[model samples]
Target: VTITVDEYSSNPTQAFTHYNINQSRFQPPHVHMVDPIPYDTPKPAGHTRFVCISDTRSRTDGIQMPYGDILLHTGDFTELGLPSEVKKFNDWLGNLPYEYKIVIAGNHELTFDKEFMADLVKQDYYRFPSVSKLKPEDFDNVQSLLTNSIYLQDSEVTVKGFRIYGAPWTPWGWGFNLPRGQSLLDKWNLIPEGTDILMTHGPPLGFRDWVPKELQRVGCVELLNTVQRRVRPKLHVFGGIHEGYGTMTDGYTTYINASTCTVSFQPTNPPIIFDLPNP
Candidate 1:
């Protein structure tokens, strides 16, 4: 028999009744964590609605997505880019009611990073015994599995006149991560100037970058530098840090961390909805 432990994020509202989600410790500059985030603004007609989600980890068994024109998925759709995992996520994406789906890969898509996989394939078997067991050909053309959506990787596409650019760079030790310097700066610099929306797997510095456990901000500094100084996108969407799941804004850009799952791996966090004037 299997037993399920009650996690706070699995059902924040009902869980809140039992446990206290001490905001002081977390101190994310948004509404307190709860079910159905209190963003009640109505979408104006002719506006382009963007519904965002990330870090689902293939646990979206019964999640909900609000109405929107474009579903902007930032990444971490699966545990690994396993054929079964990617296929499961693709089928879910196909069933979504949105007209368009703009997707990006996250560090969790280990197979999506060819460079990382190359190194892993070459490394001693003892290093990654389980992963090395799977042949490289298994994940060949894995991105093709995501046929249901426009999978972006360091590229920009104009959808309904929105110049949305997606990149899957993160600073984690595992996948697509680069040291915090010229390496990451080069990636951030690739984002064209005047981009309308920037989609990345990780957040920029100081904007929803707080991790509740450590209480330390762990966002990419170079990415933040490029965003504020040059790329000045109207909207930036991401969510690798599940704790930073909320929206914040500087004077010019709106930043959203649409992590559908919580730190506890529950897909209970609702999809964040934002509207922009139809371009």
Candidate 2:
């Protein structure tokens, strides 16, 4: 057997040496980044391992999932959160071995937000009869169909003494969007202080939020403020920007963008694993 799998050293190909070079070029002066433990690193005694994945976009098979105490899926479950799509995703979730599973919606999940559907229908209804020749009922209570995993939308849940929170607002959207005028910040602000884990569909600005095609950082600044200056959760996991799939830490809160699919819609990204001292 190859002993390299058990080694704790960093891989030379994806060099993480300068991961902590203050990160000032991509971020503000105050944010100092650091490299996270290598993916193959073993967990310490009593540590709670978290396996996170996102932006799967309805493709639910073949990717290898690592074992962990909890499994977190940060949404974009379906290409459009179609009724048939949701059921397939749920069935996939049902087969996962993780003891606890947490999920949230993403902008691509169109039918999850009643407001968006109502608005589209009220505006003369051009959305449907094109994507799938379907109507509105297919989108009703999409969250209820997620029986295999715990679905969180601006909500919180506790498991094994750890407080976990999740949301799916991207400051832009289809499903879990908010209204205008300080609306998104209000949703982010609701993320309670002392939240052990904060999960969102979009990244928080800097740290794996670069959009090369747009030639700019596309993360949410409001969320950056909420996470860095205020909430300061131990770990913040998000994955809307597929290109930003990786791990980085400010030495306070470890940030992860576990985007499972690539820019070309390939669900080839590996699941990210992190371990926290069990509380």
Candidate 3:
């Protein structure tokens, strides 16, 4: 039931049908399951709840946004960072019931990175028809567009004493990606040592970067080493591997692939929830 872009681009008439069918029938991987608890339930003292979600791709309203002290979206809030699409996403974020919301861009969020789009067009990487109408000018004032949430790129934000570092770079294989070499490794090197929470669009190698259909790993090895050896964040949250929507822990770090979409692009996967100790 995996749906690729080429399948729908060639037959736009079948896109809606294919999407609906997949949404109605797709069962996401049950990483953790429980009955829905009251969103307003009080939390224990000295603990703050955090909700992590990603890759919704403009289906924000279709899914129920849970309550949390902090909400972290790794990226891909839009299908195409069109003016209208970005506006819709910002409006939704403005209304979400979270004390703090932090977002970073993804490969699909092309316009967020001015250089990414220009490079794609310059190198003839704009292969999709959906991108033909886009231009670098669309994102000229992108930061002003997000009035509600904090948009971060290669930076750190201190929320309730938790040092969260976020960056939007991924290996240069798709849209908005950085070249898969030293330039990409240099991005990983920027993550400060002692970051409490690390956020990125893609996973590090060997943690949860499995493409079931291809039987291959697409995560960055340099990122894996950097996180394991230096940054060592308590929680590393990411979402890009739609098929790898789950969580795993390695004694020191908790890896969460909080992809809200399933393999077929259904916003059916549940948000990964965890409690961060309050200082």
TM-score between candidate 1 and the true structure: 0.84
lDDT of 2 at 157: 95
Worst 10 residues of 3 by lDDT: 25-34
Across 1-279, the per-residue lDDT of candidate 1 in tens digits comes to 111222432222233333324422223353233333434667788888899899888987798667778999999998867778999999999999888899999988888888878888777656655556778678887899998899999998999999999999986546778765567777877899879999999987666877778756677766765776778888999999888888877656788999988977799989998888877
Query: lDDT of model 3 at residue 234?
Result: 88
Compared with the true structure, the alpha-carbon lDDT of candidate 2 equals 0.77
TM-score of 2: 0.84
Model 2 Cα lDDT, one tens digit per residue, 1-279: 111110111221112222225334244444555444556687899889999999989888887878777999998988887888899999998898988899999988877877777676656465553433456566666788989998998999998999999999975536676542256677877899889999999887666877788776656656766787778899999998898888887768889999999988899988888898878
Cα RMSDs, all models? 10.5, 9.9, 10.6
* Comparison by TM-score, 1 against 3, better one: 1
> What local lDDT does model 2 show for residue 171?
55
Clashes of 3: 0
Strongest candidate by lDDT = 1
Q: Candidate 2 or 3, higher TM-score?
A: 2
Q: Is 2 or 3 the stronger prediction by lDDT? A: 2
Candidate order by TM-score, decreasing, is: 2, 1, 3
